[PDB]
Amino acid sequence: SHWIWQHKDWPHFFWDEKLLSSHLSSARLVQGKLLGIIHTINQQTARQMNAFVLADQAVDTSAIEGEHLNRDSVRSSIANRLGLKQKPVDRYIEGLLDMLLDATENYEQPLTLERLYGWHAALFPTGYSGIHKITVAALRKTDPHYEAPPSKRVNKEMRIFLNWFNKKDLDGLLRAGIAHLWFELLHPFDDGNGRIGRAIIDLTLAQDEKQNVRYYSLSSAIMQDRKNYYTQLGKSCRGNMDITLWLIWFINCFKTAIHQAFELIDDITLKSRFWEKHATTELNARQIKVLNRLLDAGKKGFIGGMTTRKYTQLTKTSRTTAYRELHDLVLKKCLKPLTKSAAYEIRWVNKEH
Amino acid sequence: MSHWIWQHKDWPHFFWDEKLLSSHLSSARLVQGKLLGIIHTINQQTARQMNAFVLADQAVDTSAIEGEHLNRDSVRSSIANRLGLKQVGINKPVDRYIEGLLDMLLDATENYEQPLTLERLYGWHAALFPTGYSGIHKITVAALRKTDPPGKIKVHYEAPPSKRVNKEMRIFLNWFNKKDLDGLLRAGIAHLWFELLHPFDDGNGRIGRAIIDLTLAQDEKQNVRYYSLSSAIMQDRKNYYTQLGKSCRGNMDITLWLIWFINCFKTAIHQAFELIDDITLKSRFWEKHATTELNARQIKVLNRLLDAGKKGFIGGMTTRKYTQLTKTSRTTAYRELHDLVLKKCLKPLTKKGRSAAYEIRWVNK
């Protein structure tokens, strides 16, 4: 009677509907805002956004498990996939990307055992997880601090989970949060349950939005909040069927993901508006190099601002030239001074210019 | 059927089914956010065009709910002067009612950080009744009624006696200024509660819908209305009064009213989606045709057709319509319409040339 899946009412999850109401409506409000932004920006800006988020998705869902991808390989593969400008094929990165893209692009298709087996084969080409040989593309046949249900139960538990999942008879955000917790508690594979469960979240949200591109990443939010994530899973797996606290945690993670996406799209459009306004500005290569470095840090900027010393670390020019070129950038309204050595920050081009 | 709702022993403690309303609120927030995200992302000029159009709908429709039928051109002319837009028609003497009505609507959405007070309501009421009369009847203006409560819909409802109105309003305003509940619920409750009190001799509907505007502006922190619940209420006028249920509402359970109110909000948002889509189609058209050579007549006609949006003119643009808008001969119209097809501005709205008509060749993303 220690684990949730031993509970007499398993797997009939329930929650405090009156309490969740204001969390869900506030989540829908920011989700709608992001969707309204994406609908209005042009296709070039959306494709750049898509490229950034997909690289974060791959990197962060891997980092959650302690696996650190070559980001250059990730970016290069995404650029080829999306048709953007710009090595050996990295089988693990391609398989991870193929799983993530199947989950958001084929959202009209049901989640089936065969489809999960394909995701699992995409993550484990060699049949090994580190040193350990595992079962690939099939449910575990043995035991995976948490004890998951015994393996003789796993095939039925998964049939119930999937019959429930494909009904879509609940608010889409709740289905995402329930599906993630339920899948994790079953741990149906020998390994890869974390990445596949987060791909299930992606599938659920793509079905909810009817949107075949993820413009935000829950993995990036989970990774940012990883300590609470593990604490909350640990509490839930020892709890009863009232998963109110898990769902509040999950909706807050969703909101964090949307807010990170607001910041990204705001940074992308701030930069392009800046360069529309200043392509008429005469600048030499060094000034253009330094402005791009600072613009890519976005609204948050450099901690101390741009300084003469940082300018000479990036350009390798003399202090006198950096000092004068920085004043030149102030005069041309590209930079503006900060407040107690001199420091500068981007002068943003806000609204129409 | 035995007692008015304001005689109920639990008045004014409205309640509703939180579980049933949850999915309506979540759905409403989603489309509200979508509109707000669009508004945040379009440029300033586009947002201002949207503002001017919604504000004319707000003025015309909140008046039409009461059987007061405004000249839309006058409203547009007054809005264009206030928002610094290109002049609409020759500047004629002002209609004090239109300017007061606009003053009220703009105060409700722009000064959203200020509380609602009796003094503020009196100012709105003075703006609506500048002559001191409601038609033939002299009425109490800029003060609560001292007696008992056209195309206006009559409802046989009895509001509280005037000796109680000031106390009832103080209770209502103390609740209103707490801002202690979900903004959409607050807008729905505020409007129902105000309507049931009928605090003024006349003007209660228009002031009650301005209170909705104030509430939504406070919810959104947005000093411009980009959608209009009056325009939605106008499409369902009869159900509006029915759903208010003034006669036979009876209990303090307002679940059905709040669900209706949330549906009207969503209708208003869905209408704004269509409007902003039409506005952006036009600006996108003029971006592509900024280099297209056109004379002033062709530009006048295209602007008139583009202002009809995707739906277009009934029957499309015709030769005769071209000559009614330009005062040109038929042969000049044949050449200029042909020229506009050649330059990809217009396209044949029919496949048959016996009768010929044209529509805008839209420029998609």
Author numbering:
A (entry chain B): 4 to 89, 94 to 151, 165 to 360, 364 to 376
B (entry chain A): 3 to 151, 159 to 374
Mind quoting what the paper says about this structure?
Here, we identify the protein product of CBU_0822, in the following referred to as Coxiella burnetii Fic enzyme 2 (CbFic2), as a DNA-binding protein and AMP-transferase that AMPylates Histone H3 at S10 and S28. According to sequence analysis using SMART including outlier homologs and PFAM domains, it encompasses a conserved Fic domain (115–223 aa, Fic motif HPFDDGNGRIGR 205–216 aa) with N-terminal inhibitory helix (TSAIEG, 62–67 aa), an N-terminal domain of unknown function (DUF4172 domain, 4–85 aa) and a C-terminal helix-turn-helix (HTH) domain (304–362 aa) of the DeoR family.
In the asymmetric unit of the crystal, CbFic2 is present as a symmetrical homodimer which, according to the program PISA52, is the only probable assembly and is predicted to be stable. Within the dimer, the interface is composed of amino acids 20–43 aa in helix α1 within the N-terminal DUF4172 domain. According to an analysis by PDBsum53, residues S22 and S26 interact across the interface. PDBeFold55 analysis of the HTH domain of crystallized CbFic2 revealed structural similarity (Q-score >0.48) albeit low sequence similarity (%seq < 18%) to Z-DNA-binding (ZDB) proteins, which belong to the same subclass of wHTH domains as proteins of the DeoR family. A structural superimposition of CbFic2’s HTH domain with the B-DNA-binding human transcription factor E2F4 and the Z-DNA-binding domain hZαADAR1 of human double-stranded RNA-specific adenosine deaminase ADAR1 reveals that this tyrosine is not present at the conserved position in CbFic2, but moved by one helix turn toward the N-terminus (Y341), similar to the tyrosine in E2F4 but with a different rotation. At first glance, superposition of the CbFic2 structure with crystallized HTH domains in complex with DNA makes dimer formation of CbFic2 via the crystal dimer interface unlikely to be compatible with a simultaneous binding of both HTH domains to the same DNA-strand of about 20 bp, if not for a major rearrangement of CbFic2 or bending of DNA.
